[PDB]
């Protein structure tokens, strides 16, 4: 029955091991082993699957500086074992091992062998024997006690202010943008914002705006004459780049995206294994636009705002990186070790606020369309019912479909039937558009590179 490497790892220490298909026997019985390292060496940490690993707690506790083991080494150890994920059997590597005390409270434990949909269940006594020399410590957190603010915008101003007071040296001012010492909104952007919420007139209005900001005019002409759009030919002017090559909405949306981000520094850290900022923006922008276009006629959101919401969904990443640099480092390390836990949870646990809150508040103060502001604020809340909830739901759905196909945005869940029924979407049809969207990875990456450059 069992792969020779797992047999070897079990030895004679697991008489009650049951090699069965992982099933409706609770997701609450599953364990997870995380491979960690620092300058002193390698270490494996075992915790309940759905718990969040608190690296800070583990490091203080052990007097170490552990972080996710480098990808190359994890690939190596898993390729040798012939497994897609190493289950929580310490002798697979022989590395020093620790177990979080919640694991021992379980009567029976389930290990996942990675991919075959198969798993091992065993009685607590057997797991205790396999981990007889693994020290116990408290370092994994039950996420049901982390109260991410998903439904209470009214408290946002105060929670953001408390976080700023407590975790920065910034003085609290009347408007968030001023507290955060952000440059004022340049005229360029204010005009884009007017045009964008406005559905009143011409292409030539957009051309005027682009011609007023010579750096925007430069990039626009660049975008249009690059290899990605090179099938265009000779790019004559700004009018030509916008009306013929790129398009009205795209230029408005990308322009807005660049304008809102000139106010911010480049993040100084990043979660390894996660897509870069512009790739995440482009993925969700394209996703949201596809989903909007597939909704029924009498219920269809505005494509331009859906794409914009997608492009901006993660803008708070830039704000947190700049406003709370050392805590953003902790967020990055935590995202690497618990990629199955959403950033909202990790951020709430560390800062008491999320990237959704901070971005949404800036969008509102800047006079962005409520569609975008509200979408950004509630993208992590699939039950959000308030004004413009369809936009927040387009982001949530997008996130789940992209992450289940392996786009590295972080944690994702199953898109439930309830959501497809609510949005008047056919599941099979959506699934075929998203299988195709993921196959267009190379062109997502190219569009994002041109935004980075």
UniProtKB/TrEMBL annotation:
<dbReference type="GO" id="GO:0002161">
    <property type="term" value="F:aminoacyl-tRNA deacylase activity"/>
</dbReference>
<dbReference type="InterPro" id="IPR013976">
    <property type="entry name" value="HDOD"/>
</dbReference>
<dbReference type="InterPro" id="IPR014627">
    <property type="entry name" value="UCP036888_HDGYP-like"/>
</dbReference>
<feature type="domain" description="HDOD">
    <location>
        <begin position="182"/>
        <end position="382"/>
    </location>
</feature>
<dbReference type="InterPro" id="IPR052340">
    <property type="entry name" value="RNase_Y/CdgJ"/>
</dbReference>
<dbReference type="InterPro" id="IPR036754">
    <property type="entry name" value="YbaK/aa-tRNA-synt-asso_dom_sf"/>
</dbReference>
<protein>
    <submittedName>
        <fullName>Putative signal transduction protein</fullName>
    </submittedName>
</protein>
<dbReference type="Pfam" id="PF08668">
    <property type="entry name" value="HDOD"/>
</dbReference>
């Amino acid at each position: 029955e069992l792969p020779v490497v797992v047999q070897q790892a079990l030895g004679d220490n697991a008489p009650g091991v049951s090699f069965r298909s992982v099933s409706q026997i609770d997701t609450g019985h599953l364990l997870r082993m995380v491979l960690l390292s620092d300058d002193q060496g390698n270490l494996q940490a075992i915790c309940r699957r759905n718990d969040m690993l608190d690296l800070e707690a583990l490091n203080k506790r052990l007097g170490r500086d552990l972080r996710m083991m480098q990808r190359r080494e994890q690939v190596r150890v898993r390729q040798k074992a012939g497994l897609q994920e190493l289950p929580a059997l310490p002798s697979l590597t022989g590395w020093p091992t620790v177990v979080d005390r919640r694991v021992d409270e379980l009567e029976a434990v389930a290990l996942e062998l990675g991919e075959q949909d198969l798993g091992l269940m065993m009685p607590a006594e057997d797991f205790r024997q396999l981990t007889a020399k693994a020290a116990r410590h408290d370092f994994a957190v039950d996420t049901a006690n982390i109260s991410v603010n998903l439904d209470n915008h009214a408290a946002d101003r105060d929670q953001l202010h408390s976080a700023i007071k407590r975790f920065t040296g910034l003085r609290i001012q009347q408007r968030l943008e001023d507290t955060l010492e952000l440059p004022p909104l340049p005229e360029t952007a204010q005009r884009i914002i007017h045009l964008r919420v406005n559905p009143n007139a011409v292409m030539g209005d957009l051309v005027d705006v682009v011609e007023s900001d010579p750096s925007l005019a430069a990039q626009v002409v660049s975008w249009a004459s690059s290899s990605f759009y090179a099938a265009a030919g000779r790019v004559h002017s700004v009018h030509d780049a916008v009306s013929r090559v790129l398009g009205f909405d795209l230029v408005m949306n990308l322009a807005m995206g660049l304008a809102l981000g000139r106010a911010l520094k480049h993040p100084q850290d990043h979660p390894d294994g996660y897509v870069d900022y512009w790739q995440q923006a482009i993925w969700q922008a394209q996703s949201a636009g596809i989903l909007a276009s597939m909704m029924p006629r009498g219920q269809r959101p505005l494509f331009g705002l859906a794409y914009l919401a997608g492009l901006l969904h993660n803008f708070g990443h830039l704000v947190l990186a700049q406003v709370f640099p050392p805590h953003f480092k902790l967020v990055c390390r935590s995202l690497e070790v618990s990629p199955h836990i959403d950033s909202s949870v990790i951020e709430h646990y560390l800062l008491g606020i999320t990237r959704e809150q901070i971005a949404a508040q800036l969008m509102e103060n800047w006079g962005m369309p409520d569609e975008v502001t509200l979408a950004i604020r509630y993208q992590k809340n699939p039950a959000y019912d308030g004004p413009h909830n369809v936009y927040a739901r387009l982001l949530w759905l997008g996130r789940q479909l992209l992450t289940e196909r392996g786009v590295a945005l972080g944690a994702g869940e199953s898109a439930t039937q309830a959501v497809y029924d609510e949005l008047g979407l056919d599941r099979e049809l959506v699934q075929e558009q998203f299988d195709e969207l993921v196959r267009r990875k190379d062109s997502i990456m190219a569009m994002a590179g041109m935004m980075s450059q």
